[PDB]
Amino acid sequence: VLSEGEWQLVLHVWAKVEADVAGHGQDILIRLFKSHPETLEKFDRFKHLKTEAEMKASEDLKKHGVTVLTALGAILKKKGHHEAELKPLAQSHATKHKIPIKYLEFISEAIIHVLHSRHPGDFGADAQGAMNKALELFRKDIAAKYKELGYQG
Ligand code: HEM
């Protein structure tokens, strides 16, 4: 479990992300798509996007970036009492979108990279450590719901 002081480092940087949810959402999905191109194939919406310039230009992509970061934000603010927010998410991503747990690892890495670019001063080593622990807790709880449904994978 994260300590109270670790949750404080997580939500202090998240308050800064909320100053520009759209810009953050974009950078993160673009990082994910460039780093792990197999993740782009899961999106019938975005599959057509070939270059980083096209990705940057897409309004629909920025719109989905907002959706993802808003959902994640609602989860983080529950500080690990996140069961009501997490279970709908795991159910759609396992059974409808078919998203392997490993891709949730990949997007965690993207989030940490972008938080590091945008917020050096608020995202030093202990904030980075806390953020990693928080995203691990997210994955761990999703994984458990996947296993239940027969998707552990
Ligand atoms: C921080 C992690 C993530 C969060 C908070 C998240 C959140 C969401 C939300 C809230 C929706 C709309 C409601 C729903 O269908 O559940 C959605 C849709 C979806 N997500 Fe995620 N997601 C995450 C990770 C991923 C990853 C890693 C992939 C792809 C590798 C993925 C693929 C999709 C797809 C394909 C859809 C449907 C998109 C469409 O409208 O066509 N998600 N996600």
From Swiss-Prot:
One of its GO terms (cellular component) is sarcoplasm. Heme b binds at H93. Pfam families: Globin. It comes from the Eukaryota. It is an enzyme of class 1 (oxidoreductase). The modification Phosphoserine is found at S3. Residues 1-147 form the Globin domain. The keyword Iron applies. It catalyses: Fe(III)-heme b-[protein] + nitric oxide + H2O = Fe(II)-heme b-[protein] + nitrite + 2 H(+); H2O2 + AH2 = A + 2 H2O. The modification Phosphothreonine is found at T67. GO terms for biological process: removal of superoxide radicals. One of its GO terms (molecular function) is peroxidase activity. Nitrite binds at H64. Belongs to the globin family. This is Myoglobin. The lineage of its organism: Eukaryota, Metazoa, Chordata, Craniata, Vertebrata.
